[model samples]
Target: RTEQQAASLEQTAASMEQLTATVKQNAENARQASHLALSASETAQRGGKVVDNVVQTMRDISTSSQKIADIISVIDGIAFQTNILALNAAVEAARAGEQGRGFAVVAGEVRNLAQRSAQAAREIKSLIEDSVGKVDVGSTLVESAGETMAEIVSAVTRVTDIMGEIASASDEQSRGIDQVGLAVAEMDRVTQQNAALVEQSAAAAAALEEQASRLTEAVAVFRIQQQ
Candidate 1:
């Protein structure tokens, strides 16, 4: 029975050792997973920052486009004023009669050029307005994209925190398992010692039994001699 208990304790100790090793490995893996999660979270934050920059750039472009449209409107107004001035000059030349005919011809040419300039300005203004509208749409989309990136970063950060907690728990579990393994080893050592002591006790008991049997035989011989 002592030997059996010794064997059982030895097996228990070995199993505990194996369990300890496995738990330690699990702890290490958890720590690595936490580290990886932190890295991923950081990467996600960087991507969010990049997205923010892109959103800002989009806004800047939109602002610049609006400014360009304003400048185009100014150009259109100047072209219209020039067209009116050329018309007034033509009328004045017409008042100067035949002597002013040459001047009137030049005024007519000036008016024609002014009209062309105004037409070009109007076309350019139309194109700029179209571009501004498109830029606004693009800016809105980029802003939304930036928001999504921020949410992703937040989620990754939460995951990192959870992983860290898991790592900590795993470490604690490993430590606990190590203590259990040590206790099991001590138990095994005690069981083996007890088994050895039991064997010694059995040997002593057998020797005592032999001495008792010899004494009984001597007593029986004495009783027969007296008879």
Candidate 2:
């Protein structure tokens, strides 16, 4: 049973990592899409018919970015709540006196660590919000760009029937897309870091859960609920 529980917790930790990676990648994608849309808007306005292709790609990018932003917010919330639980555990340990002298110290340390984690989470939340705001603005602009591009695409789509082709334009467009791609990659990188932190948090939670379970049993023999 011990081994099984250990395995289960370990699996949860791993799954947490996967989720973290997703959040990170999603954020990056969202950023990329937004920036790309911005560039597409600018290009479509300049290139006439090809502007339609740029606008379409812009909308696609916005959709994906929003989805990622939402998922990251939920994950951040989960991590923050878990840290609070760890803090509580530490406080309980501190109250146990001589019997828990060593534990109290350990608990205090854990609480501090949890506090730090909370701060980190807050920072991440701030960053995600900023990213979302930018994407939102970009999407609005891109939407307008798409309308303009659509007129061109409607007239030109028949000639080549390749929206993707139009998306790849001159040297300037290529450079713009490259910059957007870089931004997307950066967003993913941060998200990956966030995800990794969550996994560490899960492991911390499992440790706390184990200690808590033991605490429950030990308390049954003594009146800890009152004292």
Candidate 3:
């Protein structure tokens, strides 16, 4: 009976040590999971701030592009008016006939100058048309960038939601670790209960008590962990 008691005590002691280690590891893992979730949520929040800045910039660019389009339309109207002025001067010069030859020359020069001005205005219009086309493309790119930024915000928001789930899971894991701690306590309690059943049980009960103490100590260590 004495030999059996010693063997049972040694076996229970080893099992208790292993259980204590498992519980400690589980607790540490729970803490690490919780911290990771929190960090992810914080990163998402920061991304939201950046999204705000990007959205504002996109809006400003859109407004500026609209104003530029309005200016281009005004320039087109001015070019049409300059062409009319050049046509009027040419007609008046034709009316002067040969008696207004010097005046005709001056009128011809004025008409030519007006035509040049009109031509320059037309060139400007053509250039503006090309520029407007490019601006449209630029606007499209800005809109795409805006949409991309919005998607980033959405993705980050989703990540924050997933972090919430991860945080909840960590809480569940911590509770499970607590349950394991309680189970260890119950095992020690039952070992005490069995002490009266046999001489071997008395040794086992003593060993289990020591193991339960180690389990409690392990849980305490997690409190100061970097997690």
Candidate 4:
């Protein structure tokens, strides 16, 4: 009976030491987790700023494209007026007959210039319209990116909050583990003191042994959960 009681006490001592190590490791892990979460939150904030910049640039492009389109409209108007003026000059030259034949050719050349200008203006207008459409599409995409970044920022905040809670809980758990360690050490000491009465008071020793085992089992589960 005496040999068996000594063996039980030794086993409890080993379990208590193992529990202490596990608790300290958990505290360290919680602290690391909190730090990583903080880093992620900062990264998300910077990304949001970048998204804002993209949205602003897209808006600027849209404004500039509209301005270009307005300029193209003015050029098109000028080309149309020039075409009409060239046609009037050609009619006047026809009235002058043989003496106005050279003037009529000049008018024809002017009309050709006007026609080319109108065609060029039309082409430019078409290109500008295409550019404006693409700018609008780009603006819409950037706006979507901005919204997604906002959501990401919100999610990061939540994760940071949870990490804070884990850190707090880990601290409390560490304190609790310290208290448990103290109790286990005290119990081990008491076991040595009561070893002489092992066979005489076997029931009490058995009960104390059972309680220590239960404590170890309960706290041991956290080691896995924390991982």
**Number of backbone-clashing residue pairs for each candidate, in the order shown:** 0, 5, 0, 0
Instruction: Compute the lDDT of residue 71 as modeled in candidate 4.
Output: 85
Better of 1 and 3 by TM-score: 1
Instruction: Compose the digit string of candidate 4's lDDT tens values, residues 91-209.
Output: 88989888788889888888899899999988988888887788878888877877776677688777667767776876777688778878777877787667657656887789889
TM values, all candidates:
0.64, 0.36, 0.47, 0.73
| Top of the candidates by lDDT | 4
Which residue pairs of candidate 4 clash? none
Candidate 3: list runs displaced more than 4 Å: 1-16, 99-227
How much does each candidate deviate from the true structure in C-alpha RMSD?
5.1, 51.2, 19.0, 18.0
Candidate 2 structure quality by residue, lDDT tens digits, 51-165: 5556567667766766766676666666667667665666676677566767666666766766676677677767766776787687677557646665654544333333333
lDDT of 3: 0.62
lDDT of 1 at 124: 85
lDDT by candidate, in order shown:
0.77, 0.61, 0.62, 0.79
Q: Which candidate, 1 or 2, would have the higher TM-score against the true structure?
A: 1
Which ten-residue region of model 4 has the weakest summed lDDT? 191-200
- Better TM-score candidate (1, 4): 4
The model with the greater lDDT, 2 or 3, is: 3
lDDT of 2: 0.61
| lDDT of candidate 1 over 1-227, digit per residue (tens) | 44665568567767777777786776667677767766776776787788788878777877777787778778878877887877788888888888788878888788888888888888887887888788878878877876776677677777667767767777787778768777776876786677689889999999999999999989988878776
